Design an enzyme around this catalytic site. Structure first.
Site, short mmCIF file in Angstrom:
data_model
loop_
_atom_site.label_atom_id
_atom_site.label_comp_id
_atom_site.label_asym_id
_atom_site.label_seq_id
_atom_site.Cartn_x
_atom_site.Cartn_y
_atom_site.Cartn_z
N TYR A 109 24.69 47.24 93.56
CA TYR A 109 24.65 46.02 92.77
C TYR A 109 23.66 46.08 91.63
O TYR A 109 22.82 46.97 91.56
CB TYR A 109 24.31 44.83 93.66
CG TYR A 109 22.87 44.80 94.16
CD1 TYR A 109 22.51 45.44 95.34
CD2 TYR A 109 21.87 44.10 93.46
CE1 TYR A 109 21.19 45.39 95.82
CE2 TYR A 109 20.56 44.04 93.93
CZ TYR A 109 20.23 44.69 95.11
OH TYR A 109 18.95 44.62 95.61
N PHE A 164 17.39 41.60 86.54
CA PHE A 164 16.20 41.42 87.38
C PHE A 164 16.05 42.44 88.50
O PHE A 164 14.94 42.66 88.99
CB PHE A 164 16.11 39.99 87.93
CG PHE A 164 17.23 39.62 88.89
CD1 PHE A 164 17.23 40.09 90.20
CD2 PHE A 164 18.25 38.76 88.49
CE1 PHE A 164 18.24 39.72 91.10
CE2 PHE A 164 19.26 38.38 89.38
CZ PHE A 164 19.25 38.86 90.68
N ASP A 165 17.14 43.08 88.90
CA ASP A 165 17.10 44.06 89.99
C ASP A 165 18.37 44.90 89.99
O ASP A 165 19.41 44.46 89.49
CB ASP A 165 16.95 43.31 91.33
CG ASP A 165 16.81 44.24 92.52
OD1 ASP A 165 16.15 45.30 92.40
OD2 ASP A 165 17.36 43.90 93.58
N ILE A 183 22.35 35.83 100.66
CA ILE A 183 22.62 34.51 100.12
C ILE A 183 24.11 34.22 100.22
O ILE A 183 24.94 35.14 100.17
CB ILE A 183 22.14 34.38 98.66
CG1 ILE A 183 22.73 35.49 97.79
CG2 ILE A 183 20.62 34.39 98.61
CD1 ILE A 183 22.39 35.36 96.32
N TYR A 194 19.48 30.66 95.24
CA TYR A 194 18.10 30.25 95.50
C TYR A 194 17.74 28.80 95.20
O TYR A 194 16.58 28.40 95.33
CB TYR A 194 17.15 31.24 94.82
CG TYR A 194 17.38 32.66 95.30
CD1 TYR A 194 16.89 33.08 96.54
CD2 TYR A 194 18.14 33.55 94.56
CE1 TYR A 194 17.16 34.36 97.02
CE2 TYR A 194 18.42 34.83 95.03
CZ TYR A 194 17.93 35.22 96.26
OH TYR A 194 18.23 36.48 96.72
N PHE A 239 26.09 39.09 89.58
CA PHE A 239 25.91 40.40 90.18
C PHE A 239 27.08 41.33 89.93
O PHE A 239 28.24 40.93 90.04
CB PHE A 239 25.74 40.28 91.70
CG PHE A 239 24.43 39.71 92.13
CD1 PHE A 239 24.25 38.33 92.23
CD2 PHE A 239 23.39 40.55 92.50
CE1 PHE A 239 23.05 37.81 92.68
CE2 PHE A 239 22.18 40.03 92.95
CZ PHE A 239 22.01 38.66 93.05
C1 LIG Z 1 11.34 40.39 103.21
C2 LIG Z 1 11.83 41.38 102.17
C3 LIG Z 1 13.33 41.68 102.24
C4 LIG Z 1 13.67 42.81 101.26
C5 LIG Z 1 14.64 43.72 101.42
C6 LIG Z 1 15.43 43.83 102.71
C7 LIG Z 1 15.07 44.68 100.32
C8 LIG Z 1 16.32 44.21 99.56
C9 LIG Z 1 16.96 45.39 98.84
C10 LIG Z 1 16.11 43.07 98.56
C11 LIG Z 1 15.49 43.39 97.20
O1 LIG Z 1 14.18 43.98 97.33
C12 LIG Z 1 13.80 44.59 96.11
C13 LIG Z 1 15.35 42.10 96.36
O2 LIG Z 1 16.67 41.74 95.95
C14 LIG Z 1 16.85 40.63 95.06
O3 LIG Z 1 16.35 41.11 93.82
C15 LIG Z 1 18.38 40.40 94.94
O4 LIG Z 1 18.95 41.10 94.09
C16 LIG Z 1 19.20 39.53 95.68
O5 LIG Z 1 19.52 38.47 95.15
N1 LIG Z 1 19.64 39.84 96.90
C17 LIG Z 1 19.44 41.18 97.44
C18 LIG Z 1 20.79 41.82 97.65
C19 LIG Z 1 21.65 40.95 98.54
C20 LIG Z 1 21.78 39.56 97.94
C21 LIG Z 1 20.44 38.89 97.66
C22 LIG Z 1 19.75 38.54 98.97
O6 LIG Z 1 20.41 38.12 99.91
O7 LIG Z 1 18.40 38.70 99.14
C23 LIG Z 1 17.75 38.33 100.35
C24 LIG Z 1 16.81 37.23 99.90
C25 LIG Z 1 15.84 37.52 98.78
C26 LIG Z 1 16.94 36.03 100.50
C27 LIG Z 1 16.00 34.83 100.48
C28 LIG Z 1 15.00 34.87 101.65
C29 LIG Z 1 14.19 33.59 101.81
C30 LIG Z 1 15.07 32.33 101.91
O8 LIG Z 1 14.28 31.14 101.88
C31 LIG Z 1 13.36 30.85 102.85
C32 LIG Z 1 13.54 31.28 104.16
C33 LIG Z 1 12.59 31.03 105.11
C34 LIG Z 1 11.45 30.33 104.71
C35 LIG Z 1 11.22 29.88 103.42
C36 LIG Z 1 10.01 29.24 103.30
C37 LIG Z 1 9.29 29.19 104.50
N2 LIG Z 1 10.27 29.92 105.44
C38 LIG Z 1 10.22 30.22 106.87
C39 LIG Z 1 9.25 29.35 107.61
C40 LIG Z 1 12.22 30.15 102.46
C41 LIG Z 1 16.01 32.26 100.70
O9 LIG Z 1 16.85 31.10 100.86
C42 LIG Z 1 17.66 30.84 99.69
C43 LIG Z 1 16.83 33.55 100.61
C44 LIG Z 1 16.99 39.53 100.98
C45 LIG Z 1 17.95 40.71 101.19
C46 LIG Z 1 16.33 39.13 102.33
O10 LIG Z 1 17.34 38.94 103.33
C47 LIG Z 1 15.42 40.25 102.85
C48 LIG Z 1 14.12 40.39 102.05
O11 LIG Z 1 13.68 39.49 101.32
C49 LIG Z 1 16.12 39.33 95.58
C50 LIG Z 1 16.00 38.29 94.47
C51 LIG Z 1 14.73 39.69 96.08
C52 LIG Z 1 14.67 40.89 97.03
O12 LIG Z 1 13.32 41.27 97.28
C53 LIG Z 1 12.53 40.31 97.96
#
Ligand SMILES: CC[C@@H]1/C=C(\C)C[C@H](C)C[C@H](OC)[C@H]2O[C@@](O)(C(=O)C(=O)N3CCCC[C@H]3C(=O)O[C@H](/C(C)=C/[C@@H]3CC[C@@H](Oc4ccc5c(ccn5CC)c4)[C@H](OC)C3)[C@H](C)[C@@H](O)CC1=O)[C@H](C)C[C@@H]2OC
Ligand SMILES: CC[C@@H]1/C=C(\C)C[C@H](C)C[C@H](OC)[C@H]2O[C@@](O)(C(=O)C(=O)N3CCCC[C@H]3C(=O)O[C@H](/C(C)=C/[C@@H]3CC[C@@H](Oc4ccc5c(ccn5CC)c4)[C@H](OC)C3)[C@H](C)[C@@H](O)CC1=O)[C@H](C)C[C@@H]2OC
Ligand SMILES: CCCCCCCO[C@@H]1O[C@H](CO)[C@@H](O)[C@H](O)[C@H]1O
Lengths: 107, 107
Positions: free
Chosen positions: A26, A36-37, A56, A82, A99
């Site tokens: 992607y 951005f990525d 997401i 997000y 994407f």
């Molecule tokens: C931990 C690191 C872990 C990192 C990896 C495995 C490496 C990966 C290759 C990801 C990349 O690493 C370079 C990078 O990829 C992006 O660039 C991106 O391209 C993107 O869009 N991707 C990734 C590709 C799949 C689609 C989407 C995604 O699905 O990404 C997911 C994502 C970013 C979801 C948010 C998580 C928090 C939720 O909110 C919450 C949840 C719980 C919460 C709070 C607040 C408090 N709490 C709990 C008390 C808020 C929020 O809810 C909408 C959704 C990713 C895959 C998470 O599953 C896992 C991770 O983050 C993201 C922009 C940032 C992300 O890096 C970070």
């Protein structure tokens, strides 16, 4: 929701099923082109299981319509990504994401 | 081009091959939600043969990627619909159309 536009066709028969792992490539961009990525830049595919709420929403429903080998452009609205808070230091609030995804393999 | 946004999933197996008749239920809308036609209102399922350039390009390519039972929203750009020449009263010049389409069956 999520808009899916085909760029290049896949096999048109093998689609992602619940429980399978999707290996994709992607490139995430903002509504105005700002990239951005990209997994392509790091030479390492991304993986996630379908139906396990790992990615997401736009990704869950968007990639489920693609077949192996297909390259598609996913336009995802804030509520399917997000939202209003966005993601700290990378994704702005109320951001529409586009994407360039390619479904490489299912396992 | 054409953008597909799945409302409700299809069987994910039966796809129309070029040469088959698609039976659909559509609702034609303009960029601003205004509806200009609907097969639903007259309760008459529409039928067209995939392949013969009978319908607009967007439909040829859009429906081709739908499976029986699927209900999707096709967002067609001007160049895939009626293009430049507008038709006063129904469809304006260079208009983007939105079709709510449900694939009923194949014949
Ligand atoms: C931990 C690191 C872990 C990192 C990896 C495995 C490496 C990966 C290759 C990801 C990349 O690493 C370079 C990078 O990829 C992006 O660039 C991106 O391209 C993107 O869009 N991707 C990734 C590709 C799949 C689609 C989407 C995604 O699905 O990404 C997911 C994502 C970013 C979801 C948010 C998580 C928090 C939720 O909110 C919450 C949840 C719980 C919460 C709070 C607040 C408090 N709490 C709990 C008390 C808020 C929020 O809810 C909408 C959704 C990713 C895959 C998470 O599953 C896992 C991770 O983050 C993201 C922009 C940032 C992300 O890096 C970070
Ligand atoms: C004979 C009557 C016949 C009518 C019926 C069977 C009843 C149907 C239920 C149609 C509906 O009747 C309520 C009505 O449906 C709309 O409401 C609509 O919702 C729509 O958009 N539909 C219909 C549903 C599928 C998608 C799209 C369509 O594809 O419909 C097709 C369509 C209209 C294609 C255009 C054909 C003419 C081309 O023009 C050209 C192009 C180039 C040309 C020439 C002449 C010389 N050149 C060379 C330069 C003409 C133009 O080219 C982009 C594309 C329809 C199915 C035609 O195949 C068949 C017919 O029209 C249209 C707004 C007007 C249309 O009424 C008509
Ligand atoms: C409301 C839609 C009515 C559809 C039926 C009439 C079609 O007329 C033709 O439409 C094409 C695209 O619009 C133009 O390229 C042609 O030059 C024009 O003659």
């Amino acid at each position: 929701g999520v808009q899916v536009e085909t760029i290049s066709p896949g096999d048109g028969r093998t689609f992602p099923k619940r429980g399978q792992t999707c290996v994709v490539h992607y490139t995430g961009m903002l509504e105005d082109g700002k990239k951005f990525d990209s997994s392509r830049d790091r030479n390492k595919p991304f993986k996630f299981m379908l139906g396990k709420q790992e990615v997401i929403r736009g990704w869950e429903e968007g990639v489920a319509q693609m077949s192996v080998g297909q390259r598609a452009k996913l336009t995802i609205s804030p509520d399917y990504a997000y939202g209003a808070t966005g993601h700290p230091g990378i994704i702005p609030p109320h951001a529409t994401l586009v994407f360039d995804v390619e479904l490489l393999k299912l396992e």
